[PDB]
């Protein structure tokens, strides 16, 4: 039971513990979620490259968010910064030492952070350099926002009819969206948690106007809230979720507008891989019903820079690099040599 009296430094961006964790999730992903076709840039010999195709069996099993504890090896120990309000990088005041890390749920999603650690105090936003707009901003929420995304089942048709000269119920065509899904969240809870983001954002950037806009563009994985549950890759449009201007709105009483907001989602087969640069192809959606529920414990944002003034600082949903997903959980951790 030692007590060293020293100024303990801490960081989460230049942390090896995060990059090491990443390697293990990918390994767990390759033995759980396998694509039927994989396309990878065969970059051999500096000169411009070609594509590498590989076809393999793809079982539709579910990738369960099995709790992960990064424990300390013999001869090593991990420090847990127990500061009530930590900024991410810098000197930590109160820090204890546990042997294993808290239960981290391996969730690979963009824009929004689901099933994670909640802040026991207040909302804490952090970035490597807030003055720089290229750096992503990780937001931690203290109030759990439950999101429920689902998709119908086989209840379409229920009976067939045999006939010596014909059959019934087998001509299902109607070129439409059978790979469509939708989510649901509390309008009152989302707007309130959206406000607390602004409250803390203006605490770092005051005399400015915080505006929330959709994704500026890019791969569908970033533009839409992408996640996977049951074996299907969802792509929900987060346009309505992040669409509100804040520069003069601080009250709170009771106002109704649109029962519960619903997100336009779509299940896809061709996916852009997050592990390595490339694409992937999966099997068609499962026949049964897909129901998923999770708590939005945080989110990722990327503000618009530019030396050009307007008085408004726009904040669009970032995300993409899965290193930040585990960084939101391993921010208060640093592996150390037992010396």
């Amino acid at each position: 039971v030692v007590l060293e009296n020293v100024t303990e430094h801490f960081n989460m961006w230049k942390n090896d513990m995060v990059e090491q964790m990443q390697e293990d999730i990918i390994s767990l992903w390759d033995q759980s979620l396998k694509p039927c076709v994989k396309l990878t840039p065969l970059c051999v010999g500096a000169g411009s490259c070609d594509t590498s195709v590989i076809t393999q069996a793809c079982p539709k099993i579910s990738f369960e968010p099995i709790p992960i504890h990064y424990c300390a090896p013999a001869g090593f120990a991990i420090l847990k910064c127990n500061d009530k309000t930590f900024n991410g990088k810098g000197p930590c005041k109160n820090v204890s030492t546990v042997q294993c890390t808290h239960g981290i749920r391996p969730v690979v999603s963009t824009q929004l952070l689901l099933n994670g650690s909640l802040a026991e105090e207040e909302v804490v936003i952090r970035s490597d350099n807030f003055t720089n707009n290229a750096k992503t901003i990780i937001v931690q929420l203290k109030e759990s926002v439950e999101i429920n995304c689902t998709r119908p089942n086989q209840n379409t048709r229920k009976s067939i009819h045999i006939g010596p000269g014909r059959a019934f119920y087998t001509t299902g065509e109607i070129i439409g969206d059978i790979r469509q899904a939708h989510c649901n969240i509390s309008r009152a809870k989302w707007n309130d948690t959206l406000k607390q983001i602004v409250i803390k954002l203006r605490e770092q950037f005051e005399n400015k106007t915080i505006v929330f806009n959709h994704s500026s563009g890019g791969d569908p994985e970033i533009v839409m809230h992408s996640f996977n549950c049951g074996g299907e890759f969802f792509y929900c449009n987060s346009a309505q979720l992040f669409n509100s201007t804040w520069n003069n709105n601080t009250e709170g009483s009771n106002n109704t507008e649109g029962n519960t907001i619903t997100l336009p989602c779509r299940i896809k087969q061709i996916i852009n891989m997050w592990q390595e640069v490339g694409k992937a192809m999966y099997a068609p959606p499962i026949r049964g019903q897909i129901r998923c529920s999770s708590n939005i414990t945080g989110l990722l944002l990327t503000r618009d820079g530019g030396i050009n003034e307007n008085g408004t600082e726009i904040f669009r949903p970032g995300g993409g690099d899965m290193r930040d997903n585990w960084r939101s959980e391993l921010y208060k951790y640093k592996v150390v040599k037992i010396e």
């Epitope: 039927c36 076709v37 396309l39 195709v53 076809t55 065509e173 070129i175 790979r179 569908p220 779509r266 896809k268 087969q269 061709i270 694409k279 192809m281 099997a283 068609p284």
Partner: antibody, heavy 130, light 109 residues
Framework: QLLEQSGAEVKKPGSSVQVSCKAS????????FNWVRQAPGHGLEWMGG????????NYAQKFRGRVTFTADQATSTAYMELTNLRSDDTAVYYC????????????????????????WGQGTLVTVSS | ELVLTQSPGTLSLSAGERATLSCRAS???????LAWYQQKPGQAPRLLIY???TRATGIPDRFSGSGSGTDFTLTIGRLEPEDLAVYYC?????????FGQGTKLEIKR
Amino acid sequence: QLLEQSGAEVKKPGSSVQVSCKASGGTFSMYGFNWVRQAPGHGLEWMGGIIPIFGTSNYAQKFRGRVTFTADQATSTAYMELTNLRSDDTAVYYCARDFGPDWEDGDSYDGSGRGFFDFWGQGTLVTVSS
Amino acid sequence: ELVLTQSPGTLSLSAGERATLSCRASQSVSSGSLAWYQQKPGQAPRLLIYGASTRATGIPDRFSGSGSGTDFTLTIGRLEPEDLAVYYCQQYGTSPYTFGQGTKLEIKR
């Protein structure tokens, strides 16, 4: 010179005929395999296809309960069987390989492929006579 | 059910000049997906142009396509004695995938 079919033959009315399509060029699994027959002098008529890697198959309404698209990935050969042959079934059946998944814009690949076919087979003429 | 008709039925033109073909549709094609095919005498069909505009690999700059909804046209450039073939148009926006009636392109000499 890479996608070849079987040999032409004659089949008495009422019997079933099976046409193979040996795909020996590159990939067979992910690409869909449709079948479009063509009567002598007439136009092309699409029958249906199959995606080997998924086992999915989409066919035309005109051939209900008559076509059975199967694929053997071991020999990389696509099959097609048509039951209850009649005088109108006499045609040169073509085996066309679907274009494939649209990687840089499309987000799905179901049924029997994208829709159009780039690589085509030699075509086999099945004559229906007694 | 979506049926397609091709005009004209038969076209006999000389070499060097351009040729014009048309594909009329019964309904509006989904997502605007149309395919053109070239079939020489006693041979197998060849993909000419897909997506109504995009050109298939190997196909010369002479062949060009343009169309919208029901009005679809394929324009053959500098004609050649080898270009003699029956042409077909196939839609792939809605099942069943239907082909056109066909246009016999003969060559004048």
